[PDB]
PDB file of C-alpha atoms in Angstrom:
ATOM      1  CA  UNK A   1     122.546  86.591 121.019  1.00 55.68           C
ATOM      2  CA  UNK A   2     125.836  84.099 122.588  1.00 52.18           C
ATOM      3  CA  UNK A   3     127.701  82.702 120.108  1.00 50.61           C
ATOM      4  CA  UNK A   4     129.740  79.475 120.900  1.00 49.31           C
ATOM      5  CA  UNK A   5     132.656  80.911 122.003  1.00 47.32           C
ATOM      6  CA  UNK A   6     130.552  83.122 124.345  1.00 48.69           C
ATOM      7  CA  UNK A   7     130.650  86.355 122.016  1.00 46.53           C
ATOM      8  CA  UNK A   8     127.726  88.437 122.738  1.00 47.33           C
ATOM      9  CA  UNK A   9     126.146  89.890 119.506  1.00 49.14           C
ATOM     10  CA  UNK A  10     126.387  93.836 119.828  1.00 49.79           C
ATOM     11  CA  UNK A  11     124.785  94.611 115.999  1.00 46.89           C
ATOM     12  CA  UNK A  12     123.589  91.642 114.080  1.00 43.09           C
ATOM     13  CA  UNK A  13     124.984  93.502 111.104  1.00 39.83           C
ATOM     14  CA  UNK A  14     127.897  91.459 111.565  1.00 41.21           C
ATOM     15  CA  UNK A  15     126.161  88.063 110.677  1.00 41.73           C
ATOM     16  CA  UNK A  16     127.030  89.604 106.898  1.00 41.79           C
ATOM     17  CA  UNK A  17     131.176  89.763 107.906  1.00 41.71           C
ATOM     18  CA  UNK A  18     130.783  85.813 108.680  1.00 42.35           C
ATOM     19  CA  UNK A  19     128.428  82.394 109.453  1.00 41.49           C
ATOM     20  CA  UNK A  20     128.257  82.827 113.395  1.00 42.66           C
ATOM     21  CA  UNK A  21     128.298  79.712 115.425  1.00 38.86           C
ATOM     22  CA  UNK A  22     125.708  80.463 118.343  1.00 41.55           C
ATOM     23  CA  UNK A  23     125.592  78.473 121.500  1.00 41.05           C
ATOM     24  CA  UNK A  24     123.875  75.617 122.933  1.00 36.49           C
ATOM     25  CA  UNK A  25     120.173  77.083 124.829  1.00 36.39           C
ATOM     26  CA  UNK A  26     120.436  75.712 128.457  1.00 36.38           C
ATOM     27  CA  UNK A  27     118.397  76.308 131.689  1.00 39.08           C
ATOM     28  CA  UNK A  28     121.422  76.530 134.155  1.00 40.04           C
ATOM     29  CA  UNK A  29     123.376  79.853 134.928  1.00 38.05           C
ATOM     30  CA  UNK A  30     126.722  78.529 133.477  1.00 33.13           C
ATOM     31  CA  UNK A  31     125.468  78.342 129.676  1.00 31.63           C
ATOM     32  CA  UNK A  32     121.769  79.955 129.918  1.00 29.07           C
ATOM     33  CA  UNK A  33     120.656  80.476 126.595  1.00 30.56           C
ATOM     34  CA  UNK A  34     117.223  80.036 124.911  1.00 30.88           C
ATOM     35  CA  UNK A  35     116.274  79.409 121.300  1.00 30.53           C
ATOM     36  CA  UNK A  36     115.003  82.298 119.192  1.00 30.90           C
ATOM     37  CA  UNK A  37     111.348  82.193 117.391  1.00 26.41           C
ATOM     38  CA  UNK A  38     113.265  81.778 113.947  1.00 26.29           C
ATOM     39  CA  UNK A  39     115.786  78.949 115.046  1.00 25.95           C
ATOM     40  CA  UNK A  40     115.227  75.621 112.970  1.00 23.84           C
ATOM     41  CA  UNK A  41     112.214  77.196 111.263  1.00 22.78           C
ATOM     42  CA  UNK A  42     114.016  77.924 107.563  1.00 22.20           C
ATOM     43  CA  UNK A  43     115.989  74.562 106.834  1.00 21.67           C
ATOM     44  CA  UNK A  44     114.860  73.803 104.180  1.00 21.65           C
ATOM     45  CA  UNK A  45     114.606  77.303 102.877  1.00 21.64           C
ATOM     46  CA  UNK A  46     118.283  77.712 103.711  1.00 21.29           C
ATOM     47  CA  UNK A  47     118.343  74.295 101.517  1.00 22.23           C
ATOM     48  CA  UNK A  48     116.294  75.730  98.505  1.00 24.42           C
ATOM     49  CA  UNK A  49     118.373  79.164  98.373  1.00 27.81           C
ATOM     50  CA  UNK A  50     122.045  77.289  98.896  1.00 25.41           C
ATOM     51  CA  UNK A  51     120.462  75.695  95.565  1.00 27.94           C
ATOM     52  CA  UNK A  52     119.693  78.479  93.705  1.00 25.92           C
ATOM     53  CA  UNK A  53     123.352  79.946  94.333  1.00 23.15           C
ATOM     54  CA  UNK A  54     124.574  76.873  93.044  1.00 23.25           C
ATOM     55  CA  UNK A  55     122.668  76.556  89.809  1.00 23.05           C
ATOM     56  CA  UNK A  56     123.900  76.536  86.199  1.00 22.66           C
ATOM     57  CA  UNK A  57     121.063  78.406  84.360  1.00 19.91           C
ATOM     58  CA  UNK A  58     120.570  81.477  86.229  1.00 23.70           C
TER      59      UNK A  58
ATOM     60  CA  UNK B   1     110.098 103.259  64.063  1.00 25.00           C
ATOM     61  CA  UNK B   2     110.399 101.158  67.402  1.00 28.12           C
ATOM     62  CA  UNK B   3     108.995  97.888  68.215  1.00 27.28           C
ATOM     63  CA  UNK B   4     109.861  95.094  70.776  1.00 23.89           C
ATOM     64  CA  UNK B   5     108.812  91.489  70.414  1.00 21.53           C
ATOM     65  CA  UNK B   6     108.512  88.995  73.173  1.00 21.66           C
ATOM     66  CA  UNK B   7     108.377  85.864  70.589  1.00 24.32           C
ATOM     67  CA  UNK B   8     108.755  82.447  72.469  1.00 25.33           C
ATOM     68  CA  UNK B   9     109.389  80.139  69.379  1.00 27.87           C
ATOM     69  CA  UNK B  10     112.033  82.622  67.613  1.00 27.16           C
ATOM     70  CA  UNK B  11     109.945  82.083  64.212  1.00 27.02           C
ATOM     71  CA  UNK B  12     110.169  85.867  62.967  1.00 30.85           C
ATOM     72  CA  UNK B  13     113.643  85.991  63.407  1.00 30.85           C
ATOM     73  CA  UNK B  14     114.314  85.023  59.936  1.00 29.81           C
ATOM     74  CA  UNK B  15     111.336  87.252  59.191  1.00 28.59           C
ATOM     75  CA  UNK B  16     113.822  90.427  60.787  1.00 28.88           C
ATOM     76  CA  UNK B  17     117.552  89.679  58.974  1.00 28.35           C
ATOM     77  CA  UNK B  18     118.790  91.293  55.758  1.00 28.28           C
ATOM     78  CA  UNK B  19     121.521  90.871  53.969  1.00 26.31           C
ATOM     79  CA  UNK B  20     124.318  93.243  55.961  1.00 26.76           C
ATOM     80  CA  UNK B  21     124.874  95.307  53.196  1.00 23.70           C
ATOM     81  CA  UNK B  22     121.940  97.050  53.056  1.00 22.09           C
ATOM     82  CA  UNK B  23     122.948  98.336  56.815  1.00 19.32           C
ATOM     83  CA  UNK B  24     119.665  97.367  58.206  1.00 17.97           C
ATOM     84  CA  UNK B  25     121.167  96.629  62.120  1.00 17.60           C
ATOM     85  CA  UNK B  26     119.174  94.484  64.517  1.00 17.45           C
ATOM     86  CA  UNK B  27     118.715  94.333  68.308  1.00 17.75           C
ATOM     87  CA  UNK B  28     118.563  90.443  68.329  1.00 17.44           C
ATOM     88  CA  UNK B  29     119.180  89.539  72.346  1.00 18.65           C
ATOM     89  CA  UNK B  30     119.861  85.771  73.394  1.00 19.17           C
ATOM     90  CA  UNK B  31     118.512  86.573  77.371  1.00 17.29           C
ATOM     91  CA  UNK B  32     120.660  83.287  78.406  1.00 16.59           C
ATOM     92  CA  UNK B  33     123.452  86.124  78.831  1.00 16.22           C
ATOM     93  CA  UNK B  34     121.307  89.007  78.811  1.00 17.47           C
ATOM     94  CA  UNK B  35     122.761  89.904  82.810  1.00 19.54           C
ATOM     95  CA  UNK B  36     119.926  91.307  84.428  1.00 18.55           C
ATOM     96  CA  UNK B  37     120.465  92.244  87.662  1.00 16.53           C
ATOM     97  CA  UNK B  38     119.079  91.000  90.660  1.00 21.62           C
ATOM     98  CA  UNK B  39     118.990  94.324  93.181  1.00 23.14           C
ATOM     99  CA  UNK B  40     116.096  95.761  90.599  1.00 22.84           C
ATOM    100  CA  UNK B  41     113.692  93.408  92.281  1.00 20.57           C
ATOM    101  CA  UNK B  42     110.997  94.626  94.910  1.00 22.15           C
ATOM    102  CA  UNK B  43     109.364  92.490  97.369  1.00 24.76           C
ATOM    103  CA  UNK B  44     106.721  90.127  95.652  1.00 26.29           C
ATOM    104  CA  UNK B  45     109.315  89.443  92.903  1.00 29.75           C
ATOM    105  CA  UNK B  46     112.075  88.802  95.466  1.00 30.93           C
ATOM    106  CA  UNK B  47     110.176  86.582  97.693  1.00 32.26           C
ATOM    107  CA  UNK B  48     109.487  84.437  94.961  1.00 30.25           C
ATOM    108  CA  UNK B  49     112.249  83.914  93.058  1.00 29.60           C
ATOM    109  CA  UNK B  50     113.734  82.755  96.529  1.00 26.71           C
ATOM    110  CA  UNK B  51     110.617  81.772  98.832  1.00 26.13           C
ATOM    111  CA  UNK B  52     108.412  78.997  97.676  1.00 27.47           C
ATOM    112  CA  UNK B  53     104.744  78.296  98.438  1.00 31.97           C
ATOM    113  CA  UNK B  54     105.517  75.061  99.987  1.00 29.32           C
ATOM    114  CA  UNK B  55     106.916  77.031 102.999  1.00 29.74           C
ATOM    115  CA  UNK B  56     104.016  78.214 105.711  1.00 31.72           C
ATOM    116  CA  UNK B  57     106.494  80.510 107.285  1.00 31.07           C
ATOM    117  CA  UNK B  58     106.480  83.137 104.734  1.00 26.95           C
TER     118      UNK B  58
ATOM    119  CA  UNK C   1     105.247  93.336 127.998  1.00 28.35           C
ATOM    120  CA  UNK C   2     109.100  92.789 128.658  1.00 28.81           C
ATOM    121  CA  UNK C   3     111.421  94.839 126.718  1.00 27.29           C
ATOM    122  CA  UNK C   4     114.828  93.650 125.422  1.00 26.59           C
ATOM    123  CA  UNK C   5     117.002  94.952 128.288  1.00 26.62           C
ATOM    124  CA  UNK C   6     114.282  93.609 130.587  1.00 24.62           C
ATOM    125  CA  UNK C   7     112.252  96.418 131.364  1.00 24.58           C
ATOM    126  CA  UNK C   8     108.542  95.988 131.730  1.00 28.25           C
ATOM    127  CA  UNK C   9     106.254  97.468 129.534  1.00 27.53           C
ATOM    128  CA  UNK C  10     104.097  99.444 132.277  1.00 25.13           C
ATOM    129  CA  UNK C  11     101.692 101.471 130.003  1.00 24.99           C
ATOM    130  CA  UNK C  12     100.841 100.611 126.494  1.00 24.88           C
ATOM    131  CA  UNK C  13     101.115 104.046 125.247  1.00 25.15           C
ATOM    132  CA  UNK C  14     104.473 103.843 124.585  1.00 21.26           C
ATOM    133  CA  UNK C  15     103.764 101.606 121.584  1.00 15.07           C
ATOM    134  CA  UNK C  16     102.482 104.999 120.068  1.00 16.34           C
ATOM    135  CA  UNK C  17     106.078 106.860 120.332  1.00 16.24           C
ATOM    136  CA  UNK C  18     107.987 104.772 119.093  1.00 15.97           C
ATOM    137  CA  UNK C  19     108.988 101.108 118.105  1.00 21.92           C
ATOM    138  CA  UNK C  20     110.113  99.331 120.616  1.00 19.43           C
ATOM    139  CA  UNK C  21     111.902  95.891 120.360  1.00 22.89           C
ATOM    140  CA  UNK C  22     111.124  92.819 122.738  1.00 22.37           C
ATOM    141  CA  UNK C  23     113.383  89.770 124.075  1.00 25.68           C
ATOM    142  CA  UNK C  24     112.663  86.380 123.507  1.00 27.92           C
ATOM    143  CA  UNK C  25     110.351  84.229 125.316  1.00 29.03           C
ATOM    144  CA  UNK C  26     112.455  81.631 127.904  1.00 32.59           C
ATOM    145  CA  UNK C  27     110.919  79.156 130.111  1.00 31.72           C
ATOM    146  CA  UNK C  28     113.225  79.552 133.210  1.00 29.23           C
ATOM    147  CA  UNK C  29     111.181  82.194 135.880  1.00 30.46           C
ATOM    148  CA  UNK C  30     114.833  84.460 136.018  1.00 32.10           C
ATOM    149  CA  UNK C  31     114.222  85.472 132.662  1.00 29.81           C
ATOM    150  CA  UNK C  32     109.893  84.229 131.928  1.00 27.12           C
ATOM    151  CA  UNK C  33     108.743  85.102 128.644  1.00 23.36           C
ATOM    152  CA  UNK C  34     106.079  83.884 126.398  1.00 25.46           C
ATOM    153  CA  UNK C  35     104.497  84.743 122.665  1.00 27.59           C
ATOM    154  CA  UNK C  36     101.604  87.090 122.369  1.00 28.24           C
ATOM    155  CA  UNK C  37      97.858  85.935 121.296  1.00 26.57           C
ATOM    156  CA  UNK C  38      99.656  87.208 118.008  1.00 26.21           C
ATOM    157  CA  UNK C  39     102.703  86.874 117.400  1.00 24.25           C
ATOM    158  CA  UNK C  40     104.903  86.808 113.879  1.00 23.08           C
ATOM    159  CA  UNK C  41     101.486  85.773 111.744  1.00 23.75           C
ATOM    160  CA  UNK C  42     100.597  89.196 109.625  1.00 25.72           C
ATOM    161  CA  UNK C  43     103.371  91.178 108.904  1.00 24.15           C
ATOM    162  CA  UNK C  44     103.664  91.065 104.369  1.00 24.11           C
ATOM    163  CA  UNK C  45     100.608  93.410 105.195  1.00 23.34           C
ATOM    164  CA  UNK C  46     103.062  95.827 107.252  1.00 22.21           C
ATOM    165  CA  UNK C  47     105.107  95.505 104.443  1.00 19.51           C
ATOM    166  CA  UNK C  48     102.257  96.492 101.857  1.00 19.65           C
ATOM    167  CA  UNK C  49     101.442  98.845 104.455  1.00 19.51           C
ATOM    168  CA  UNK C  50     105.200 100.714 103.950  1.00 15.31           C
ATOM    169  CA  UNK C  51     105.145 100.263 100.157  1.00 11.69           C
ATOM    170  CA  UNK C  52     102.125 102.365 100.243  1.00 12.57           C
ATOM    171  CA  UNK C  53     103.425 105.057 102.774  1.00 11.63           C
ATOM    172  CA  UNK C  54     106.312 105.393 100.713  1.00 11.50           C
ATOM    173  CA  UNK C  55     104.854 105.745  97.411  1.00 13.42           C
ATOM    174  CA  UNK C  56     105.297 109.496  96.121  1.00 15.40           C
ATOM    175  CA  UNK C  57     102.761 108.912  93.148  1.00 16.86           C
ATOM    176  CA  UNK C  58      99.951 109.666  95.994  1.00 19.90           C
TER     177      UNK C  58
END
């Protein structure tokens, strides 16, 4: 995984350190990058759980 | 003796408390601030106190 | 199969060793990839499958 500054993700462990900005997925050499099979597929489940950590009853 | 109660409309509470002189103690818990923790969970319990049904993706 | 570095899976076999982790489908021909006939739809019955492997009741 290529983040945005070009970063190349050794361990994914370090997602946990910090939110990772990952790069735009291009065909050309310069930026070549392709979207993984979980990118834009939780939204909304990112939206439900940022909800939950932000509730006043749990 | 040892019994636990899961009442839902507190009515036996009154039914449990003693004047404090007669040193007659009582476990009464108010689970609004009871802190259970959340790393006790396993999977099915996890995934749906986060997860929802409405998601396909599961 | 393609691996993650790139190598090519040439027997199947290997699958019985050991687990084996596999890159990302991409569309350009440098880097070709594409999802199996079954890809990321059963795996909550690997994960029953591990709570039972791991169970020392049995």
């Amino acid at each position: 995984p290529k983040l945005s500054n070009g970063e190349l993700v050794e361990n994914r462990q370090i997602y946990f350190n910090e939110k990772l900005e990952f790069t735009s997925s291009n065909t050309s050499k310069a930026t070549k990058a392709s979207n993984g099979p979980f990118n834009g597929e939780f939204n909304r489940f990112l939206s439900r759980f940022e909800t939950k950590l932000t509730d006043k009853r749990l | 003796s040892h019994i636990i109660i899961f009442d839902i409309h507190s009515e036996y509470k009154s039914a449990f408390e003693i004047d404090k002189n007669e040193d007659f103690n009582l476990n009464y818990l108010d689970v609004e601030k009871l802190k259970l923790p959340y790393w006790l969970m396993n999977s099915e319990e996890l995934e749906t106190l986060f997860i929802e049904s409405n998601e396909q993706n599961s």
